[PDB]
Each structure stands twice: as structure tokens, then as C-alpha cells.
Design a protein around this ligand. Structure first.
Ligand code: RDF
Ligand code: ZN
Length: 651
């Protein structure tokens, strides 16, 4: 019988009323200092790592055997062995990159830049901006074409623009990274520094006209469907008509310009930008995008910046972990099929479905018991909740990889073939009915998700294991673990983004203005509540960026606690390990989040992660949960206590 709670993780010298996070995790945290390759390590990573070890065996077994060309076993074995083949990768050096760089150097003028972007984007690139095919937000049954602002290497545009000393140091390390890899690619000292500085200048200019991370979360702002000619007739600084023609999209009548104001400013930036500076931007981007796929010196330069500088790590993960991760990103469902055959019991799928339906019923009750919302919006909320698509364990049909060509000539060349396959597979959806059954994660992912355009909640097999889902545990702990996860994904249907989408996945208003304003006032109170909290000295939590996840955590806690009480109706509350079932619910929840984390990684996740830090998902989120105050008799002098007027309950 797998224990329901690791009691040894707990630090019972801490009062649960003062620091519940360390009460439930503080001895695990003392006994598990971070290893050099980890920027953060906690319960999710434990389960991730043990799942990865299972996948490691699957992949190593395939790599040891013989397979026919054109099977998935051949594709997996060949990608993985090439990634693992440090002798060949180090022998080849930068040679696999040579022709790609020559193609960029040959771009003769601005017109040729446009055609180059179309050619690389036809391979899956994002030369100056992103583009993708997926459901129309306002017609979720039809696939349309979307364009999005420049993907930035540092992710948050603020890294490029903030004027303080620590931000300048990060920028200088990024430029040193580009200089290092340009030298490794064969440029002399002068050209490598020129390329690094020009690339950073171009990327900083693009970051300036990008939307902020918080602004990218605004649903209505980032949808702008229109006739193509309406935009391309007016904004001709970038020759969209030639670009679209070379992407074979001349007959495309409409598109979704997601960051419309970025593309209006991009019109002038592209028309006026120095050609040599743009070429250097393209060179640095191509080298950086190849740096995980060549010789050790490239991969270590990349680690020096993205690992050591940005995250505080001092070692790379072992090569097999990077290699399994790469294979899983291109052939993940082929691996997922083997994984579930070997490790996923059917009893888990059926027990999980009963659990999800119990949570759905509890959420129906929470919505019925709201009093801040009028009856008419409440009825639309129930309609949405009753139409969740539930996906558990694995997809009912597996992805067909048969057109993916893997040759084994070089790691980088096959990476490009795998990416081309994924790109062609995406473009093939254009103008076709949306496949609503598709999984956006693999069975072996230790995670779960909500998707607004299908109104689906999805629970991969790998997350249905202890400490989330433990078929031997008492109910209280399973509700505190996977039950809160389920309710968290459900609440995403009703957070500041998902509330905009209806039961069919369409971005259609189902709110009265008055109820929406009330939601927005209450949500802003939860945002400001978290932004009062310090994640490090002088650094506030970003309550705005994490607002959707904090709403979902709170919803998961309230829904799952209600479902747990429902399930306990007609039973007497037996203590276990000296804890009431109510206390075991909260301890089981807090045990999901115990982690150690490097100071650098605290700063990085505050800039890029919409999820709060694990410590705040326990110590801050629970301060709004009245049932938690009761379970541990929290008084006004306890450090966990929040004054009632400052508490906020959204749903
Ligand atoms: C309630 C929770 C158990 C499930 C929940 N999944 P959820 O956010 O809905 O699913 C997806 O997660 C990421 C892939 C995306 O960035 C999100 O926008 C969302 O779509 C979550 O917190 N996922 C975390 C889990 C996680 C990943 N790495 C971790 C390291 C430590 C602790 C937790 C984690 C995450 O994706 O961040
Ligand atoms: Zn979430």
C-alpha cells in the first residue's frame, strides 16, 4: 500500500497556522537540496523524473534493436541515437549549419528578405513573426490562419527594455551568448561581435513593438479576424502579397491578425530596417535555433546563458534526458502508446471518470450557490459546465506519423525534417473541420489542461499516480491532490480568459455587463492581493499575470473540498495519522507543491510563468479558503490569517 501522505516530508516543528507550506513540506525541503542540474525540484519533478525513467527504458529498448525504414520505432531510434551520439555531433561541429548560413548571407535586398521569410516559414520557421493554423475563436469548428508577434528569445519583452543594473547584466550575457555561438559557427572575432550586437539591436526593436506578456492574455484584444486584402492593401512596408504567394496562400481570403498593433508597427520597422542588421538578426536566430543540435560547444554556450545565467543551474541534465525530451516532442504519441500499454491500468481510467463527474457536480453546486451573479448569467454558466468534454489517460485514436522522413544523415538535418513534417501537418488543417478529439498533451506528460476552443479538460495517464491519484489512499487525500487538479482545470473554463468562451468553444459573450463588471472587480482584488506578496527581497509576485492560475487554484480547492464533503456524507470522520479528514485534504494539497527553487529561478518564473510559485499556491491561495481556517483553527494572531475583508472568493 503506497502511503497516502509522506509524513516524513512534514516539519511538525512549524505551526500549520503560521506556515502551512513548510508544515507540510519543510523536512522534505531540508532533506532534498537541489542537485546542480536543477533550478527547481519538488513533487511534480519527482513524478516527472520517474515517468521519464520509464520512457528512457522504452526508448533505449528501441535504440538497441533493428527496425525497418519508415516505422515509428525506426524514427524514434534514429532521432534518439543521433542525439546521444556525441562522437559524431562533435566531429561534425558546425558543418550541418553551413548551407543554412550561406542562404542567409546570399539575401541580396529587402525583396529577397521577404521571399526568404516565406521559404523558411514554409519549413516551420518563424522568421520575423509567427503563423499557425487552428480553430477560429468565433467559429470553433473551422480551422483558419493566424499571425502573431515575433517570438523573443528572452520571452518577456521587459528583458530587452528595463533599465536597471540587473536587467542590463542579463542582456550582456545574452549578447555574449550570441557572440560565442557566432564564433563557433565559423565567423571571425569581428564578425561574431558584429552579428551579436546587430541581432540584439534588431530583437530589442521588435520587443519594443511587441505586446507585453499581460496584454497577450486579453482575449478580445488578441483576436482580429479580417479580410487579408484589407490589411495587405494598406500595410505594404512588408510585402505581404509576395510572402503569402510564396507560402501558397494566394487564395486565402481571411486571417486572424492576433497582435494587430504589432503588425501595424512592424510595417514601418521592416520597411526602414538596415538590411545588414536584419541579415545578422537572421544569422543569430538560425545559429541559436541550431545550438541544441550540433557539437557540445554550442549546447554548452546555450546552457551557460539559459541555464546558469537565467536559472542558476551549474550543470546540464544528462544527455539521455535531453534526448528523450526531444524525441517526445516530435513522436510523443508513439511513445505514449507504448507507455500506456505498459503502465496504465484500466481501473485507473474508470475510477478517474467517476471522480471527474463528482467534481463536475460539485462545481454545479458552487455555481448554484453564487449570490453575486444574476440568474440569467448563472444559467449560461451551468450550460457551459454541463458540456465539458472529458479526456482521460490517452486519446482514442493515435497520431499518424507515416509521412515523417527520418534519414539518419545528421541530428540537425533530421530535426529539420521532423519540424517540416509537423509544419505540413498543421498547414493541412487549413479550411478543414476542427479535429476536437486531438490531444494537446501526451499520455506520459505529468500535467493536465483546459482548452477553451473545445471546452475540454484533459488528464494524461502520467498524472494519475501518487501523490495526485493513489488508489490506496483515503478519499480526503485523493480529493486534495488529483481532485484539486481536476477542479483547477474546470475553473479555467471560468477564469478571466475562459469565461469569454461558450459551451461550444466559441468566443461569444454569455455575460450581462453588470455580472462581467462584478467578476472583473473581484478578479482585480485577487490580482492585487497576490501582488502584495514578496517572492524575494524587493520583488513582488505578479498578481496580474498569474490571475488566471490563482482563480483556477482557488476554484479547484473549493470545488474539490465540496466534492470531498459530498463523498463523506453518511460516514464518521476517522482520524488517520492524528489528522481529521479535513486536515488530510489540505495536507494532501500542500504536498503537491513542496519544492526547492534557486533564487535566479524565482526571478525567471516571476517574469515568464503564469503559475504562482508553489510556496504561494499553498501559503497565499489558502488564505481565501474558509474551510482551511476551520480545519486548523486559524486565529487573528496566526501568520496565515488574512483579515476577512481582505479575503476574496471568485467562484
Ligand atoms: C493544477 C495543476 C496541478 C495543473 C495545472 N495545469 P494547467 O496550467 O491548467 O495546463 C497548462 O499548464 C502549462 C502547460 C501552461 O503554461 C498553462 O497555461 C496551461 O494551459 C498546473 O498548475 N500545471 C503546472 C504544473 C507544473 C509544471 N512544472 C512544474 C514544476 C513545479 C510545480 C508544478 C509544475 C504547470 O504547467 O506549470
Ligand atoms: Zn492552470
Amino acid at each position: 500500500p503506497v502511503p497516502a501522505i509522506d509524513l516524513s516530508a512534514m516539519d511538525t516543528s512549524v505551526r500549520p497556522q503560521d506556515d502551512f507550506y513548510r508544515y507540510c513540506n519543510g523536512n522534505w525541503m531540508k532533506n532534498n537540496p537541489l542537485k546542480p542540474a536543477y533550478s527547481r525540484y519538488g513533487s511534480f519533478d519527482i513524478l516527472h523524473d520517474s515517468t521519464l525513467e520509464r520512457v528512457h527504458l522504452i526508448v533505449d529498448n528501441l535504440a538497441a534493436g533493428q527496425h525497418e525504414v519508415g516505422t515509428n520505432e525506426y524514427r524514434i531510434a534514429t532521432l534518439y541515437r543521433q542525439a546521444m551520439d556525441s562522437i559524431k555531433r562533435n566531429k561534425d561541429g558546425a558543418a550541418p549549419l553551413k548551407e543554412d548560413l550561406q542562404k542567409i548571407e546570399a539575401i541580396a535586398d529587402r525583396a529577397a528578405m521577404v521571399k526568404y521569410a516565406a521559404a523558411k516559414d514554409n519549413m516551420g520557421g518563424s522568421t520575423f513573426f509567427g503563423s499557425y493554423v487552428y480553430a477560429d475563436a468565433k467559429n470553433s469548428e473551422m480551422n483558419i490562419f493566424h499571425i502573431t508577434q515575433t517570438g523573443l528569445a528572452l520571452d518577456n519583452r521587459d528583458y530587452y527594455l528595463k533599465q536597471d543594473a540587473k536587467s542590463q547584466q542579463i542582456r550582456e550575457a545574452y549578447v555574449a551568448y550570441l557572440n560565442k555561438i557566432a564564433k563557433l559557427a565559423g565567423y571571425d572575432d569581428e564578425a561574431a561581435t558584429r552579428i551579436a550586437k546587430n541581432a540584439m539591436k534588431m530583437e530589442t526593436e521588435l520587443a519594443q513593438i511587441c505586446y507585453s506578456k499581460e496584454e497577450l492574455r486579453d482575449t478580445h484584444r488578441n483576436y482580429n479576424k479580417m479580410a487579408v486584402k484589407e490589411f495587405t492593401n494598406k500595410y505594404q512596408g512588408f510585402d505581404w502579397t509576395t510572402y503569402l504567394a510564396d507560402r501558397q496562400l494566394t487564395t486565402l481570403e481571411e486571417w486572424d491578425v492576433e497582435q494587430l498593433d504589432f503588425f501595424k508597427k512592424f510595417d514601418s520597422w521592416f520597411a526602414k530596417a538596415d538590411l545588414n542588421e536584419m541579415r545578422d538578426y537572421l544569422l543569430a536566430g538560425t545559429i541559436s535555433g541550431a545550438a541544441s543540435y550540433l557539437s557540445d560547444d554550442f549546447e554548452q554556450a546555450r546552457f551557460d546563458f539559459f541555464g546558469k545565467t537565467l536559472s542558476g543551474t551549474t550543470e546540464m541534465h544528462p544527455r539521455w534526458k535531453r534526448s528523450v525530451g526531444m524525441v517526445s516532442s516530435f513522436l510523443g504519441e508513439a511513445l505514449g502508446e507504448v507507455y500506456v500499454k505498459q503502465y496504465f491500468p484500466p481501473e485507473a481510467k474508470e475510477r478517474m471518470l467517476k471522480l471527474v463527474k463528482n467534481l463536475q457536480t460539485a462545481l454545479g453546486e458552487r455555481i448554484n450557490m453564487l449570490t453575486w451573479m444574476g440568474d440569467s448569467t448563472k444559467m449560461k454558466a451551468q450550460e457551459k459546465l454541463n458540456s465539458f468534454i472529458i479526456k482521460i489517460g490517452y486519446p482514442d485514436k493515435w497520431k499518424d506519423y507515416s509521412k515523417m522522413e527520418i534519414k539518419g544523415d545528421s541530428y540537425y538535418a533530421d530535426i529539420k525534417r521532423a519540424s517540416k513534417w509537423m509544419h505540413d501537418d498543421n498547414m493541412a488543417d487549413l479550411g478543414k473541420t476542427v479535429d476536437r478529439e486531438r490531444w494537446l498533451m501526451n499520455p506520459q506528460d505529468v500535467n493536465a489542461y483546459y482548452n477553451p476552443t473545445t471546452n475540454e479538460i484533459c488528464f494524461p495517464a502520467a498524472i494519475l499516480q501518487p501523490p495526485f491519484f493513489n488508489m490506496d489512499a483515503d478519499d480526503a487525500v485523493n480529493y486534495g491532490g488529483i481532485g484539486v487538479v481536476i477542479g483547477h482545470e474546470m475553473t479555467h473554463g471560468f477564469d478571466d480568459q475562459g469565461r469569454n468562451f461558450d459551451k461550444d468553444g466559441n468566443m461569444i459573450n454569455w455575460w450581462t455587463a453588470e455580472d462581467a463588471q462584478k467578476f472583473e472587480t473581484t478578479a482585480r482584488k485577487l490580482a492585487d492581493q497576490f501582488s502584495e506578496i514578496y517572492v524575494a527581497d524587493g520583488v513582488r509576485a505578479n498578481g496580474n499575470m498569474t490571475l488566471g492560475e490563482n482563480i483556477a487554484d482557488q476554484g479547484g480547492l473549493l470545488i474539490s473540498y465540496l466534492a470531498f464533503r459530498n463523498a463523506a456524507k453518511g460516514e464518521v470522520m476517522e482520524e488517520i495519522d492524528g489528522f481529521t479528514p479535513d486536515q488530510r485534504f489540505f495536507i494532501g494539497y500542500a504536498r503537491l507543491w513542496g519544492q526547492n527553487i534557486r533564487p535566479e529561478e524565482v526571478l525567471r518564473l516571476t517574469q515568464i510563468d503564469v503559475h504562482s510559485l508553489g510556496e504561494l499556491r499553498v501559503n497565499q491561495a489558502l488564505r481565501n479558503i474558509e474551510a482551511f481556517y476551520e480545519a486548523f483553527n486559524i486565529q487573528p494572531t496566526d501568520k496565515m490569517y488574512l483579515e476577512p475583508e481582505k479575503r476574496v472568493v471568485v467562484w
